């Protein structure tokens, strides 16, 4: 298939493995999650423009809006963790081991 689709899929997998290998910050995890969402937006957009499938052109905007709402929810969770420990470090989120 098309050569640009390779790069958009590979970008999704790069942001996946960034989201699947944390360092310390929860914000870096949220950024990897939104990089995944951005790559999904780009790939859906290039297909829908490429196929001239007219009614799915509203689809990526929906894919934006919901997920950005999702992002807002994630930011609030980070802030609540940041209102508990002072930082957003994921190693402070370990009370549920016992």
């Amino acid at each position: 298939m098309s050569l640009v689709y390779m790069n958009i899929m590979m970008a999704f997998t790069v942001s996946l493995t960034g989201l699947l290998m944390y360092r310390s910050h929860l914000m870096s995890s949220l950024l990897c999650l939104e990089g995944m969402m951005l790559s999904l937006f780009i790939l859906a957009t290039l297909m829908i423009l490429n196929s001239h499938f007219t009614l799915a052109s509203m689809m990526p905007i929906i894919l934006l809006v919901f997920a950005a709402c999702e992002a807002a929810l994630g930011l609030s969770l980070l802030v609540m963790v940041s209102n508990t420990y002072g930082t957003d470090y994921v190693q402070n989120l370990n009370l549920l081991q016992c």
């Binding site: 298939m1 689709y5 999704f12 996946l16 989201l19 699947l20 929860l26 995890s29 999650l33 995944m36 969402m37 999904l40 790939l43 859906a44 297909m47 196929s51 499938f53 799915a56 689809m59 929906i62 894919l63 919901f66 997920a67 709402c69 999702e70 929810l73 994630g74 969770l77 980070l78 609540m80 963790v81 508990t84 989120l93 370990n94 009370l95 549920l96 081991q97």
Partner: protein, 347 residues
């Protein structure tokens, strides 16, 4: 929480699951999962302690990862089919990604690693919603894509869920983690029979939701989250020990109880398809789930652990908690095996 806001948020949880169940477009499937997660996050943060914020953060991260893998599976389906019908997928890569996404949303092993934490971090009612209502939408999507689900992948997920949910509950003393590892093992049982007969998948899901709702309703009616506080129930309310006895013997699949009903039927549908080793090892691994159920019945009904003195004050008050459908769910989780051929209503 404001009760009007609580009602609107719970109707939004239900509306997300309904939009997953009734829609014919993959974007509306993804939208229903997004709406379900977005509305269920405040139900988990109902009490505002750091454990609920940690549980909601872990739940958000796993369900958001699953939603993004779901949308990548949808987008690859759009690549290789040009359409959006919620049916079989037209690429094994999209099938693998959607099976991974739904195994994450169900918390099947080895994506189980959020289920015992999050259930421990949230209250018992939100744990009831997580372990019963949050299974219905991904099992519906698995119900509709079973022409494209790889056999080896879903059976590996099934046996790994049954074994890990067996060995996980053997070390536990918290009741919510016990119900969570029980959840993992039962989801393994439900997806092991998905490609063979999905009616028995629906049967196992309904019987599991009845038994789980019975156990969480008993845990709420007695205000018990640990084994050792459940062991004070005989000195407070001796009927509840008999109820947790018969319901924990039913969740272990001991006949003549109703929880013997699914797994037997599952074996009954896996030997027709000439699989003998697999339901045998599944049923042998279910003895682990039975073992920690028997541990709880020894702690609660069949012996009497020592109580404290302040229990004498709690004798002077009856339970004013709304035990909604608790006799109904107790009957329907124990005495239902003579009505086993009712399962054809799920065909």
């Amino acid at each position: 929480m404001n009760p009007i806001i609580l009602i609107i948020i719970l109707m939004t949880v239900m509306l997300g699951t309904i939009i997953v169940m009734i829609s014919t477009h993959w974007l509306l499937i993804w939208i229903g999962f997004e709406m379900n997660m977005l509305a269920i996050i405040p139900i988990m943060m109902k009490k505002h302690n750091p454990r609920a914020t940690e549980a909601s953060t872990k739940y958000f991260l796993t369900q958001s990862t699953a939603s993004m893998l779901l949308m990548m599976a949808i987008i690859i389906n759009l690549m290789f089919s040009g359409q959006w019908t919620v049916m079989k997928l037209f690429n094994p890569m999209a099938s693998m990604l959607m099976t991974m996404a739904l195994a994450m949303k169900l918390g099947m092993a080895p994506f189980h690693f959020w289920v015992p934490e999050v259930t421990q971090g949230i209250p018992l009612s939100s744990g009831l919603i997580l372990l019963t209502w949050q299974k219905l939408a991904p099992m519906s999507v698995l119900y509709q894509i079973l022409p494209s689900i790889n056999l080896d992948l879903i059976l590996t997920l099934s046996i790994l869920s049954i074994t890990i949910g067996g060995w996980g509950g053997l070390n536990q003393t918290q009741l919510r983690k016990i119900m969570a590892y029980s959840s993992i093992a039962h989801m393994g049982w439900m997806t092991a029979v998905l490609l063979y007969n999905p009616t028995m998948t629906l049967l196992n899901l309904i019987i599991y939701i009845i038994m789980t709702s019975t156990m969480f309703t008993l845990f709420m009616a007695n205000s018990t989250t640990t084994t050792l506080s459940l062991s004070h129930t005989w000195n407070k309310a001796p009927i509840m020990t008999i109820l947790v006895l018969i319901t924990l013997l039913s969740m272990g699949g001991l006949p003549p109880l109703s929880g013997f009903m699914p797994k037997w039927m599952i074996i009954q549908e896996m030997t027709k398809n000439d699989s003998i080793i697999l339901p045998t090892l599944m049923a042998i691994t279910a003895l682990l789930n039975l073992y920690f159920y028997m541990r709880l019945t020894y702690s609660t009904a069949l012996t009497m652990f020592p109580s404290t003195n302040n229990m004498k004050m709690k004798w002077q008050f009856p339970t004013t908690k709304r035990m909604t459908l608790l006799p109904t769910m107790t009957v329907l989780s124990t005495m239902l095996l003579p009505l086993t051929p009712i399962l054809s209503i799920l065909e």
